[PDB]
Symmetry: C3
Subunit: 149 residues, 3 copies
């Protein structure tokens, strides 16, 4: 009875949809996501900002963006080394924007930073220290994505 089978399959679907959902809530917890909080992740791979921005999307995530002191200390914890942030000023030199829109609300630059130094530095990378410094986007640092609370 086609009528039946369908309903049965709509059941096998929901159960799976519910399982995979559970599988993911346990995968985040595993990855250290705090309760109802945006949490970061990294494979420790170094690459240009175009590839990181890329990779974070394929994983349905955004390039890491510290919107306060905590999230910054937290991003430092994850990468060890230097890693790009979801911040650039490619649109308007000197005017840093989150890859997700909006102007920086929380910052943490180093003395004389940013500075577009040399041929021009449009990407921001937090360095093993917690402070940030602007650098060439064609450079290559630790890829780090974030995921919604």
């Amino acid at each position: 009875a086609i009528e039946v089978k369908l309903a049965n399959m709509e059941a096998e679907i929901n159960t799976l949809k519910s399982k995979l959902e559970l599988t993911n809530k346990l995968h985040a917890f595993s990855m250290g996501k705090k309760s109802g909080k945006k949490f970061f992740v990294t494979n420790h791979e170094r690459m240009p900002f175009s590839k990181v921005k890329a990779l974070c999307s394929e994983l349905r995530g955004t390039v890491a963006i510290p919107r306060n002191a905590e999230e910054n200390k937290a991003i430092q914890e994850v990468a060890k080394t230097s890693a790009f942030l979801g911040i650039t000023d490619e649109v308007t030199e000197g005017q840093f924007m989150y890859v997700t829109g909006g102007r920086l609300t929380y910052s943490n630059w180093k003395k004389d930073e940013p500075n577009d130094h040399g041929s021009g530095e449009d990407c921001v990378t937090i360095v093993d220290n917690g402070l940030w410094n602007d650098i060439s986007c064609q450079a290559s640092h630790t890829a780090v994505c974030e995921f919604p609370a």
Copy 2:
């Protein structure tokens, strides 16, 4: 068509259920689960007891309960920091019971503990050296969950 399509989706639900199962195995493996033995998991987020309880449930698991030494240690290694256990005497002061039910059948308290200190301590937290100590349920300690072997 209609009948065939309904068939093509049959094997789909199967191959799925089949992949998700394998995927869940790979995870457990990756999160420490040892062969045939239950396994503990944590985000390290310190919190009150009641939360750890709701949290482990949302994940369809339970607050970590050492049922002997190997387990007590296993929880000790994964937590790396003060953590609650599925054990409390909030029912009958003086008698600790598992959240899953029953009376304590294994312990590893430290000198003079439990002491139902101050106004009262009805919650258990594995502490340094893997020893135990009752502390207020309100206090905040690492949430840890266990999933079946």
Copy 3:
């Protein structure tokens, strides 16, 4: 109804297929898988070679096989202790092969290794500095599986 419910369902299914392949991509990512590079996993369990060969197969993976300095160091940083490698000379003493077939094309033995010490040593473990040492396939060591790039 029926026909519409079917097209709607087929969509639901393709959605799950994607959501899962995502779950999978995000996991390998957090497990340090570098882009286009085979990643190595572990539960840290120590066991005999035969037991590892099997554990890796149940996950459809294989015993980690370092073929260059990179992969070695990767694995070495995954084990954190000694672990078997998908390499042995069980068939012809002094002619180490890959469990996946063929003679070795790269090694990183310790000094004066391999030595087939005692009753014999036909297996291999990555030890310190990721250096190699042929051991007894019956000795228990960290199980580490590898999955496709």
